[PDB]
A paper describes a structure:
Human thymidine phosphorylase (hTP, EC 2.4.2.4), identified as the sole endothelial mitogenic and angiogenic factor, belongs to the pyrimidine nucleoside phosphorylase (PyNP) family. Thymidine phosphorylase, providing pyrimidine nucleotides for DNA repair and replication, has also been shown to have angiogenic activity in vivo. Here, we report the crystal structures of recombinant native hTP and in complex with 5-iodouracil (5IUR), a substrate with a Ki of 0.48 mM. The active site is located at the interface between the α- and the mixed α/β-domain.
Numbering used by the authors:
A (entry chain A), B (entry chain B): 35 to 480
C-alpha cells in the first residue's frame, strides 16, 4: 500500500518494479491522495533512485496511457526535441514548425511551467483558442496537415506524468534526476520517434545550475533513452541569461513569431538552428550539423516554418483568421492580438558600462511572483505578464537608459522585487563584445 | 509561497515563525494542496526541525483553532493524559473516566489511528452513536455532567493538527520527533490544563522503538511543554508486546470496560493506575504518586470510573439505554452490544515452548490490512476487526494450543498473513515466568 511504498523510499530503499508500477497505477486511477503523491515525490527528491528504478518509472509513466501509432510512411520522419526548461526558452515554438517544413513529423508532447521555468504549453495558451489537449487521432490529423503539433499530457497521453508534473512544479520536487528523466523520456517514448534531441540547460536559471549535474542528467537521459530503444542526443546549453529578449508567455509567442519570419535575436535563432541541425543529423535527414542547421535556418527565412506554425494553430483550435493574422501580422499587430499586461514598467541602467550579463534566475523569480508561474497546481497564470530585455549582452549602455521593461497586472514593483531585477543587470566597463551562443556541447548515446 | 517554504525545509533550512504560521494558515484555509502538505511533511520527516521551529509549530497548530475557555472554578482540576500510540493501548479509555472519578476535569482531545497504531477516537467509534466532534460549548456541558470527554480535532479545535495528523498517518511521516511534539502539545495546550502526562512508547511497535529516541521525545514533550507554560510529565512504557489481550477497536472497548469492572489484564490496569497516579500528583490533587495510583485504582472498582464512562458515552451521543447496557452488561453481553467481526480464525502454537513474547508490530500490521488501519485519508475502518491474545507472555504451551484469535470480516487469513502472525509468537526454551510491567520510567518538567 501507498504508505509502505513511501516509507521504503523515505528510508532510502529502492522500489521494485511492482512497487513503482503500483504507485503509478494508484496515481492514475486516483486512489493515491495528494499528500501521498507529495510525500513520495519528496522522498524520491531527497533519497533518489538508481537507473533501474528510474527506467521503471519511465516505462510506467509511458504506459500509464496510450502508445502513439503512425503511418509507417512516417517512421523515419518522426522527430522531436525537448528542453529541460529555462527562461525565455521558446525554442520549441520555433523548431516544431521549422522541422515540419523540412518534411519532418513532430508529435510534440511538452508540458506547462515547472518551478521558475516556463512551459511551452502555457505559452501557446496565450493564443486564443489554442487547445493543448488533443487525442491521438487528432494528433495524427495534425501531423498530416501541418505535420506539427504541440500537445500536453492527458488521459490518453502519459496521464501519470501529467499528474506528477503538476505536483512537482509546486512541491519543490522538480530538480530530481530520476523524475526529470522518467518525465521527459516517457513523453517522447510514447511518440514513436526516430530521433530526439533533449536540450539540457545548465547555468543560473537551469533546473540544475551546476554544469556537472547538467551533464549527469544529459548522460542519463541519453543512456536510459537508449536502453529503452530511443535514438537520443542531449545538448548542454547555457541558461545563465534568458534566451532571446522576451520572457513570459504572450511575449515569447511574438518573439517566436519574430524568429519565424527571419528576424529575432541571434541567440534564439542560433539555438534553434543548432538543435534542429543536430536533430536533422541524428535522424539522418541532414548529412552534417552545418547542413541541418542551414536547412532549418532556411526554413526560418523561407517562411515555411511560420506557415507550418500557422496550420498547427488552426488545427489545434485557433480560429484560422487569428492564425493568419499572428503569422501575417507585424510585431505590433501580434502584440495586440495576444494577451497584454496592464502596466509597463521600464528599468533604467544604474551606470555607464557593458551589459556583461542579465541574470535569468532573478528575472524569472520576479516574473514568477507577478503571475507568470504557479505556486499552486491548477493555478491560472497571468498571461501577458513578462519582460523585455531592451539591451543585449555585449552592448554598452549609459545610466538612465532603459534595459528592461516589466509587463505587469498588479502594483508597481515591490521594493525587494526591484532590487532583485537591478541585481540581475550585471555591468562591467569594457569595450562592447559579441555575446556567446547558448549551445555548449552535444552528449551522444554510448 | 508554499513551493519555496518546502524547498527551504527540503534543503535543510529552518522555517521562520512567519513561515510556519504561513504554512499552517495555508493548511487550515485550503491554499495548501494535498501534494504540498505531503511534500512539507516528508521534507520535515527527513531534514528535521529545531526546538524553536517545533515550539513555533506547536503554537501555530494550537492557535489554528480555538482556545478552550473553562469556568475559573475548574482551572486547577483540568487535567489530561496522552499516548504516543501503540497496540492495544486502550489506556485513555480506562484512565479518562477513572480520573473523572476523582473530581478531575478531563477535556481529552485525542485522535484516530496513526500509522500502525490504533487511535482512541476510532475505538470510541465502534460504540454505536458515539460522536467524536464536539464543539467547545458541548465540551463544557460534557465536563459539567460527566467530568470527562474524548473528542477529536475539528474546524474549531486544532484544525491544522487534524489535517497534518490524517496526512502523516498515510505518508510515513508519523515518526518525526518535531511533528509528534507539536501535534500532541498543540491539542493539550488548547485544553487549558494544569498538568499533562504523556505516555511515550518505546519498543517493537512504538513510533520510536529505540528507547533512547523515545526519551528524546519524552524530553522534548516536557521541555517544549514547559516552555509553553504547561506542566508536563512524560512516562516511557514498553510496546514490544500488546497492551492487554485485545487488539482492535470494538474489542479494545470490551477489555477496557472489563478493566473498569475491576478486572482485566495486569498490563492495562497497571499502566492506568501508574500514569493516573503521576497525573494526580503532577496537578497537585495528590501528595505523592502512589496515593494517586491508589485513588485511580480505587475508582476502577469504587467511586466508579465505569460510572463516569457511562455518562460520557451518553453525553457524547450514545443512546442512554445502550450506555447503561454496556456498563451493567457482562463481557458476553458487551460483545453482543458492539460490532463483531464477521468470522473468527484461530492460530495454533507452531510448537512446544514458553511464550517469551507476542510481537505487537507484526500483529498491528496484519490487523491493519484486514481493515483495522487506514491507507488513505478518512478511509473507513472495519471496527469489529481485531485480535484476541489467547495466550499470555511467560506461559508454556504445546503444538496445537490456539494462541491467537483473529476477528476478520473478509477472506480467511492468507499465507503471508499467517506466517507473519506466527513469527509474532516467540517461544523460548526457558521456564515459565511472570510478564513484566509496561512502565519503565518517568521524566519530569524541572
Ligand atoms: O517534460 C519535462 N520537461 C522538463 C522537465 I525539468 C521535466 O521534468 N519534464
Ligand atoms: O496526538 C498525537 N498522538 C500520537 C502521536 I505519535 C502524534 O503525533 N500525535
Amino acid at each position: 500500500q501507498l504508505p509502505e511504498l513511501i516509507r521504503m523510499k523515505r528510508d532510502g530503499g529502492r522500489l521494485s518494479e511492482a512497487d513503482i508500477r503500483g504507485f503509478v497505477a494508484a496515481v492514475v486511477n486516483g486512489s493515491a491522495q495528494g499528500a501521498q503523491i507529495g510525500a513520495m515525490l519528496m522522498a524520491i527528491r531527497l533519497r533518489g533512485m538508481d537507473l533501474e528504478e528510474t527506467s521503471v518509472l519511465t516505462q510506467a509513466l509511458a504506459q500509464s496511457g496510450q502508445q502513439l501509432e503512425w503511418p509507417e510512411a512516417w517512421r523515419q520522419q518522426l522527430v522531436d526535441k525537448h528542453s529541460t526548461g529555462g527562461v525565455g526558452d521558446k525554442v520549441s515554438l520555433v523548431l516544431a514548425p521549422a522541422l515540419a517544413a523540412c518534411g519532418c513529423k513532430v508529435p510534440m508532447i511538452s508540458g506547462r511551467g515547472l518551478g521558475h521555468t516556463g512551459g511551452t504549453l502555457d505559452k501557446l495558451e496565450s493564443i486564443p483558442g489554442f487547445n493543448v489537449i488533443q487525442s491521438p487521432e487528432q494528433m495524427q490529423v495534425l501531423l498530416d496537415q501541418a505535420g506539427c503539433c504541440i500537445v500536453g499530457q492527458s488521459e490518453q497521453l502519459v496521464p501519470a506524468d501529467g499528474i506528477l508534473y503538476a505536483a512537482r512544479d509546486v512541491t519543490a520536487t522538480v530538480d530530481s534526476l530520476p523524475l526529470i528523466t522518467a518525465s521527459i523520456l516517457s513523453k517522447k517514448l510514447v511518440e514513436g520517434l526516430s530521433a530526439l534531441v533533449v536540450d539540457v540547460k545548465f547555468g543560473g536559471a537551469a533546473v540544475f545550475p551546476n554544469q556537472e549535474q547538467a551533464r549527469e542528467l544529459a548522460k542519463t537521459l541519453v543512456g536510459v533513452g537508449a536502453s529503452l530503444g530511443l535514438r537520443v542526443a542531449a545538448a548542454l546549453t547555457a541558461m545563465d541569461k534568458p534566451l532571446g529578449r522576451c520572457v513570459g508567455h504572450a511575449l515569447e509567442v511574438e518573439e517566436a513569431l519574430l524568429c519565424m519570419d527571419g528576424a529575432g535575436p541571434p541567440d534564439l535563432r542560433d539555438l534553434v538552428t543548432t538543435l534542429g541541425g543536430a536533430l536533422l543529423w541524428l535522424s539522418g535527414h541532414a548529412g552534417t550539423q552545418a547542413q541541418g542547421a542551414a536547412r532549418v535556418a532556411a526554413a526560418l527565412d523561407d517562411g515555411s516554418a511560420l506557415g507550418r506554425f500557422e496550420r498547427m494553430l488552426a488545427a489545434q483550435g485557433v480560429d484560422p483568421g487569428l492564425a493568419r493574422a499572428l503569422c501575417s501580422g507585424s510585431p505590433a499587430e501580434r502584440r495586440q492580438l495576444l494577451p497584454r499586461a496592464r502596466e509597463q514598467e521600464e528599468l533604467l541602467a544604474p551606470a555607464d558600462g557593458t551589459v556583461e550579463l542579465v541574470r535569468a534566475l532573478p528575472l524569472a523569480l520576479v516574473l514568477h511572483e507577478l503571475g507568470a508561474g504557479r505556486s499552486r497546481a491548477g493555478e491560472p497564470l497571468r498571461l501577458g505578464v513578462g519582460a523585455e530585455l531592451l539591451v543585449d549582452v555585449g552592448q554598452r549602455l549609459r545610466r538612465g537608459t532603459p534595459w528592461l521593461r516589466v509587463h505587469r497586472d498588479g502594483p508597481a514593483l515591490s521594493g525587494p522585487q526591484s532590487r532583485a531585477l537591478q541585481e540581475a543587470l550585471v555591468l562591467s566597463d569594457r569595450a562592447p563584445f559579441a555575446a556567446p551562443s547558448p549551445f555548449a556541447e552535444l552528449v551522444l548515446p554510448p
